[PDB]
Amino acid sequence: VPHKSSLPEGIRPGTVLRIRGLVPPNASRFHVNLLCGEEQGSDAALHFNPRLDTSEVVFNSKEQGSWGREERGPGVPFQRGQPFEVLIIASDDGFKAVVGDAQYHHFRHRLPLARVRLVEVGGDVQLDSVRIF
């Protein structure tokens, strides 16, 4: 069951998104989206996509219906059947992705932080909790 929730006051430099979860033994890929609307085709300020099937972690944005320029993280800090903790930190420069006990990747802002209205966590993932700090 996915987490999809509205952010009334949007997000700000200092906003922290904490995702504690579990990658299922049959999992292929799951996603963490910071969205600008409620639609399935809304703009995405951030698309965080761990892919167990291809052993990649793809960062991207989405504007006017098109995925932007793909960025990729160093290695895959995720594993089928293993728990994870992910911090997504909105700074004034971009989003910092923290997995485990280390800084994983920095994703520079392509869309203004002011446009982010919604958080989505879904895909092949089992959730313990999703927090907005």
Next chain:
Amino acid sequence: VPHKSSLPEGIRPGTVLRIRGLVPPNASRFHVNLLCGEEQGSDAALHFNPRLDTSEVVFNSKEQGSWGREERGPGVPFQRGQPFEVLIIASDDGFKAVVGDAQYHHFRHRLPLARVRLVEVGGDVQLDSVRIF
């Protein structure tokens, strides 16, 4: 403990200080300090001080050698003999304290965030992890 770490690039909005450890069986109090210098006698932008004995968590700053006005968090989110996790998040407004799963307290800036250069953790506390993202 006493963990003393420098922050060379300083800290900007979007910085997270994660402290993991254990509160001792007969702990009285411990502290987390963000100092505006490399020495302990430096000014404190933030004094995070859980007091297990008087059952309170005191927030304050130190300027020219004297404490500012004391703030107190809602109750004590710490239990003696139990492990804890604390997030200290820097934003535009101030510092956001997160203990466990709950946003605990917002401490609005008194000293400029750009003055912070050192993290100090000490007191009755067994540290397991101190990290800055």
